[PDB]
Amino acid sequence: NEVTLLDSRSVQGELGWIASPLEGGWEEVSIDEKNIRTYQVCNVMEPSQNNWLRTDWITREGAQRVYIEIKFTLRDCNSLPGVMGTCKETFNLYYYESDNDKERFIRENQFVKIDTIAADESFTQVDIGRIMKLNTEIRDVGPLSKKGFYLAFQDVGACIALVSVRVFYK
């Protein structure tokens, strides 16, 4: 059934993921023995956030339709002390087709939006851990035509940890 083109969890060395801004936005965060890589961002105080993070080049292997499965956790705005009218609880998924497996720089506006993505469950001040709150959202993208493509995630003001990104086709 499912042929995996990408699996963030199982990546050996560096992910090679680009982050715009390079600092202060999407940061790689590790947390190991009996208790792991994650990308996070939590500028729920700051106004007009626009933090992107994009994968490296993903071949599509001649598949007309590929799926994107993301697992992530996210902190209930109600539970972040100090938060104003700025804090969000969703984040955006984008994609960009291309044949250039070695693209130099992809402006934000070159990407197509796939969906806004929301948490079925969120963290609070009560939680101590809680894989029970590990969200898993799956999206797919329509008639593909180039050799491969770049996924992208756009935080607009939430407190989020991406836990796993996996791209496959059926």
UniProtKB/Swiss-Prot annotation:
Organism encoding this protein: Homo sapiens
Record remark: domains: The protein kinase domain mediates interaction with NGEF.
Domain (Eph LBD): residue spans on this chain: 2-170
Family: Belongs to the protein kinase superfamily. Tyr protein kinase family. Ephrin receptor subfamily.
Localization, UniProt: Cell membrane; Cell projection, Axon; Cell projection, Dendrite; Postsynaptic density membrane
Known tissue expression: Ubiquitous.
UniProt effect for mutating Q12A: 10-fold reduced affinity for EFNB2
Protein name: Ephrin type-A receptor 4
Function: Receptor tyrosine kinase which binds membrane-bound ephrin family ligands residing on adjacent cells, leading to contact-dependent bidirectional signaling into neighboring cells. The signaling pathway downstream of the receptor is referred to as forward signaling while the signaling pathway downstream of the ephrin ligand is referred to as reverse signaling. Highly promiscuous, it has the unique property among Eph receptors to bind and to be physiologically activated by both GPI-anchored ephrin-A and transmembrane ephrin-B ligands including EFNA1 and EFNB3.
Subunit record text: Heterotetramer upon binding of the ligand. The heterotetramer is composed of an ephrin dimer and a receptor dimer. Oligomerization is probably required to induce biological responses. Interacts with CDK5, CDK5R1 and NGEF; upon activation by EFNA1 induces NGEF phosphorylation by the kinase CDK5. Interacts with CHN1; effector of EPHA4 in axon guidance linking EPHA4 activation to RAC1 regulation.
